Symmetry: C4
Subunit: 117 residues, 4 copies
């Protein structure tokens, strides 16, 4: 009956590839392959921690083309990240305490040209 | 596991009223807009300001249907001015299996809060 | 199965009566009578919107003595509110959509010397 | 209705490590402290900085038990420095009826992160 909020998964230190300098559009668009590795769903709430500038903000994920390696921060969120910035993108899920106690988040690590693992 | 998913949003509406001496804290929204985005009276919402980048949270109430109003008359007026473009969103939870096919309710706007 | 986050209740425009100038203690302590009127529980998460200075922060409620009319912002939260500031204190609850569609929040309105109603 | 309630907290621990060139985003916490406050590995937490008033959110991981460590080595280092006093909290949900008698797990500290 008591329900925990747990890290579901994250993209650890991916690089922002696009940020609408016009603040058009919405959401953070993410290569479907990266969503798959982190267990993140289209339209799922996400938290973004910008390691480069310290900004922390929340939005939702949408899928970019598989293999594009895109991390695109659009809309209002382009006020909080720029091309080249290193970010951690996380989703959180809820579950009962017993499940939470053995829960393992899905983590994808990145380097270079948004190369996963 | 239970996911948090985008229920719906108003994509790029303008703030229409923002006098910080109205006393409230809610964002009052044309009921036609609430209907399109599936947002409820008294539902938590997030507001993302496209003009100034400020991001904040409050709850929704109805403004007259047809009025096209987006009002942060009240406390939320520290975060938006009239003419500012914003995105207003709400989020819901549901089991993972349902979340995988979930479709948010999105309303798009042009000009003077005209729904497309 | 789809679950909404709804305003449970709020204290509308109460005045802060104490704010640890030392940043000691924790939480926001609230006259039990006010908690009762707003449907807010001891240890419940609350959002505070400071109408005087525009600051928005989240913490948890604890009960102050019934009839004390206390609104005390302690700990880190005294960095965000001062004695005399006008605040709105809200709690949010989750429930299914059908229940959300006819839900009525508990609202307590204040004036003067934290006089309710 | 489902309430959000304070599950537990570490009341006035000091940040012990905060080098922003460690690359992470989590807050690493002595397992003895996690045990006392009921906070889990990978659980969302809120951190409230008593020294500078900054408030932020991340998740918990274990540091060695006995180490007395509170580490924001990583991204959260923009929000706290070593020697800063913080409160670390987690929140859980449960039905209203259970929430009415819920008791959070609170650990109090003195001096050099010594649990009382």
């Amino acid at each position: 009956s008591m329900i925990r909020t747990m890290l579901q998964g994250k993209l650890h230190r991916v690089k922002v590839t696009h940020a609408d300098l016009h603040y058009e559009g919405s959401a953070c668009a993410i290569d479907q392959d990266f969503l798959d590795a982190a267990g993140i769903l289209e339209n799922e709430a996400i938290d973004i921690w910008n390691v480069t500038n310290g900004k922390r903000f929340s939005t939702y994920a949408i899928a970019a083309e598989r293999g594009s390696r895109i991390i695109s921060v659009n809309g209002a969120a382009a006020h909080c990240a720029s091309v080249g910035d290193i970010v951690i993108i996380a989703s959180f899920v809820t579950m009962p305490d017993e499940e939470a106690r053995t829960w393992r988040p899905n983590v994808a690590y990145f380097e270079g040209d948004n190369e996963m693992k």
